[PDB]
């Protein structure tokens, strides 16, 4: 690999707890002497933040990669500027666009380039005796850059470049984020005096800039300044004595705060809205003081743990190929009916073997057909011209739709249309495909009209003469390969079904599992859904019934499709959560009553 | 009793139960039916409270 480092005393990650730390201004507006209740991403109060060290002490030096969830509260503490830069990106492969922020003697550079980083990047400085300064020794953080859709350079400056030791006289906090493409940052500086673990108090963080970059970030890194000197062995693998360094890394969550803007518009205090009941009552009352009494707060609910699935023991496959172009279909006027049941089905056959151009459903999303359980699926077979493929729809018009085959408005099913030109392109033309041109009155949904008599347009009763005003509504087609694409035949199949009427065994490939009792768990019984506790009751179902119902017209009891027992359903737990307090002025201990 | 019995009316949706709506159909095309149900139940609650 690239250059590496040795003498890394691996230790478990030290832990410490923040104390009302890492609260920033949610937005740009200004308020005076109010108590706003914002809802954004914040570091939880009294959370658990992972310590990290780079101080050699000994033989301690660590700055590995860390995951980057929706925000990081990077709070370093430095005295001689040992931690300088940052790395962002997705995999740091120099193939997915990545960000970089270096604090060089020239500028605080920001780059968006496909940089190729080694496994141990850093910033190198040496204490030359001829000139007691700190110059860069090996700036080989990256290999090169191919495409860079965004670059920026800030103003020039000159760092103090300290090479001394001592307690961290200052403090630095940063909250990196990423929303709607945009990349943000926050900062705040305070010359706090301490030697050890992060101090007490509460302070706010101010916005700095908003980068309009569009990369996706998952995992990040950190630069260090190696304090190379003559006492070091003198190599990129073992010559280094860095010195004091310390920085923590927190993670954000979708919490809810209640900030208290003071008169000047600054933030002086904040209360977490879910840490303990007293804070919840403060959040509810929109005040920092709670008067003696009993208050109301959020509700209590038991959360389900396990999910169970039950399905009847069915193994026979559903014959679909013998319906999809087996040998031949029928004409429009005399369409083909077929009832399929008592088999396990699937939809993937409608997505892999032949991606039919026209595939649009109604009432049911096409991708959800696995779980919901069907009942007596119906199929239709016929072929129409490509001009009027839209005629088959719930609420459209047209000659064949209103005269040969009409859909009900409440039709619940999918429709599939796909050309078969090679099968139906005869140079002489196949003319068994017909239509009903005329009819005195419209028809009924899913009703056949096999009448092929001589239609009488007007007067002169026909009596089998086919004279004037006696025409034959049954007319053939002109399907030849020379015809246009619009007139080319389309093969149309209508998938019709109804659900939730009776115990059926037609639905999909889901699999069963064991049955549990006396626990608030989810369930799925032949496509049913809900949540509750399943006990054993004493109801005597008649040997044709399936469900049970209350006076509220809901599901009370069900029947196991396999064991044929009778189970019960009961909601898990309701109830509010009151809070008993003597008063924030008096004390800060509360008693909680679950109703 | 009337407030309970109001919990079984479609108000215009294809079914009167929310779980069936969210299981059989894709949410971006189910938000309208959810809105219908929410409007009906809000009306019932306002009547009862007044």
């Amino acid at each position: 690999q690239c250059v590496n480092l040795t003498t890394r005393t691996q230790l478990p990650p030290a832990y410490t707890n923040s104390f009302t730390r890492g609260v920033y201004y949610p937005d740009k507006v200004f308020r005076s002497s109010v108590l706003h209740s914002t809802q954004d991403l914040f570091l939880p109060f009294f959370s658990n933040v992972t310590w990290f060290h780079a101080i050699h002490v000994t033989k301690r030096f660590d700055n590995p990669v860390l995951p980057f969830n929706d925000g990081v509260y990077f709070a370093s503490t430095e005295k001689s500027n040992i931690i300088r830069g940052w790395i962002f990106g997705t995999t740091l492969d120099s193939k997915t666009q990545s960000l970089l922020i270096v604090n060089n003697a020239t500028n605080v550079v920001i780059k968006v380039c496909e940089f190729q980083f080694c496994n141990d990047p850093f910033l190198g400085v040496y204490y030359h005796k001829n000139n007691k300064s700190w110059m860069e020794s090996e700036f080989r953080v990256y290999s090169s850059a191919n495409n860079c859709t965004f670059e920026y350079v800030s103003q020039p400056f000159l760092m103090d470049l300290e090479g001394k030791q001592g307690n961290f006289k200052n403090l630095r906090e940063f909250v990196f984020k990423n929303i709607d493409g945009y990349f943000k940052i926050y900062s705040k500086h305070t010359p706090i005096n301490l030697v050890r673990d992060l101090p007490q108090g509460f302070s706010a963080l101010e916005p700095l800039v908003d980068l309009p970059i569009g990369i996706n970030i998952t995992r990040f890194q950190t630069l260090l300044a190696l304090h190379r000197s003559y006492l070091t062995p003198g190599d990129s693998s073992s010559g280094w004595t860095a010195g004091a360094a310390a920085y923590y890394v927190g993670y954000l969550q979708p919490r809810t705060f209640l900030l208290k803007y003071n008169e000047n518009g600054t933030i002086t205090d904040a209360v977490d809205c879910a840490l303990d009941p007293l804070s919840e009552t403060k959040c509810t009352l929109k005040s920092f003081t709670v008067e003696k009494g009993i208050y109301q707060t959020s509700n209590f609910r038991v959360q389900p743990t396990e999910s169970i699935v039950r399905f009847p023991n069915i193994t026979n496959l559903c014959p679909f190929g013998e319906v999809f172009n087996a040998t031949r279909f029928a004409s429009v006027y005399a369409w083909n009916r077929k009832r399929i049941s008592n088999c396990v089905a699937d939809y993937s056959v409608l997505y892999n073997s032949a991606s039919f151009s026209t595939f649009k459903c109604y009432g049911v999303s096409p991708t959800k057909l696995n779980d919901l359980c069907f009942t007596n699926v119906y199929a239709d077979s016929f072929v129409i011209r490509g001009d009027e493929v839209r005629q088959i729809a719930p609420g459209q018009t047209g000659k064949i739709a209103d005269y040969n085959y009409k859909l009900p408005d409440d039709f619940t099913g999918c429709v599939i249309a796909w050309n078969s030109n090679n099968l139906d392109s005869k140079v002489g033309g196949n003319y068994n495909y017909l239509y009903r041109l005329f009819r005195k009155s419209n028809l009924k949904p899913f009703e056949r009209d096999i009448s092929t008599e001589i239609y009488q347009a007007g007067s002169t009763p026909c009596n089998g003469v086919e004279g004037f005003n006696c025409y034959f509504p049954l007319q053939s087609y002109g399907f030849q390969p020379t015809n246009g694409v619009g007139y080319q035949p389309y093969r149309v199949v209508v998938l019709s079904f109804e659900l939730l009427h009776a115990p059926a065994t037609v639905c999909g490939p889901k699999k069963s599992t064991n049955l549990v009792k006396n626990k608030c768990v989810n369930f799925n019984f032949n496509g049913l859904t809900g949540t509750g506790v399943l006990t054993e009751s004493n109801k005597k179902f008649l040997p044709f019934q399936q469900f049970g119902r209350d006076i509220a017209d809901t599901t009370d009891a069900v029947r196991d499709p396999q064991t044929l027992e009778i189970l019960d359903i009961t909601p898990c737990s309701f109830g509010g959560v009151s809070v008993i307090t003597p008063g924030t002025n008096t004390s800060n201990q509360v008693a909680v009553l679950y109703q | 009793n009337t407030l309970v019995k109001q919990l079984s009316s479609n108000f215009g949706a294809i079914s009167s139960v929310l779980n069936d709506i969210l299981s059989r159909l894709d949410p971006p095309e189910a938000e309208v039916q959810i809105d219908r149900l929410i409007t009906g139940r809000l009306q019932s609650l306002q009547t009862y409270v007044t």
């Binding site: 309701f574 509010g576 | 407030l3 309970v4 919990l7």
Partner: peptide
Amino acid sequence: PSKRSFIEDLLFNKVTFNGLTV
């Protein structure tokens, strides 16, 4: 069991789940 009188007892014996807590 309680300290109710006789007429109070006579009056007592003559008079007769979605979030609906009581």
